[PDB]
Amino acid sequence: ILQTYRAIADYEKSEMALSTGDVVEVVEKSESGWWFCQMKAKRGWIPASFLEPLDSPDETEDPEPNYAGEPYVAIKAYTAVEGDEVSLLEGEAVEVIHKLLDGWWVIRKDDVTGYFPSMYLQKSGQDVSQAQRQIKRGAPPRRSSIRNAHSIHQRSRKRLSQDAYRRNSVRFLQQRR
């Protein structure tokens, strides 16, 4: 594949500067002495909440809400920090109504709606141990936990308030119980 080389000195700007010790992958060697290279890609898991799409403030792949609800149970206890969050003890049953991609799902419990970490929930009637081993990291931080976020979009991201979620929830819910 691509050969890996190392910079033995600093090179100033060639849209890429070089710092001694830098590791690069050589894409094209040339007898001209100028080689086209790329820095080792920097990858990793990050909280979706800290990101915003470039083209628009709104996420394009969030699934649609389902007010009918899906039965889930808390597999890990969580204490609400903000008013729009739901506190649950392990074993408490809830109904998921919006599986948002930022990890904080809207759930319904006792006629009211609020957010809860998806990672701490599992469909009812399944192996709890299995869902717990799937937890290899804590709940991601919420966007509302960010102080002084900076956006490139003047318009705010579209997201129903908990009151709006509740009004839809009480009207279009489905109980098989």
**Bridge partner residues of 105 (DSSP):** 116
Angle at 69 between CA 138 and CA 165, to 5 degrees: 80
- 3 state SS for 22-84: CEEEEEECCCCCCCEEEECCCCCCCCHHHCCCCCCCCCCCCCCCCCCCEEEEECCCECCCCCC
Residue 129 is classified by DSSP as: H
CA torsion angle for 138, 83, 170, 110 (degrees, to 10)? 70
List, in order of start, the domains of the chain with CATH numbers. 1-41 (2.30.30.40), 68-123 (2.30.30.40), 124-177 (no CATH)
Phi, psi of 31, deg, nearest 5: -70, 0
For residue 67, what are its two tokens?
A: 């007010």
CA distance 110 to 170: 10
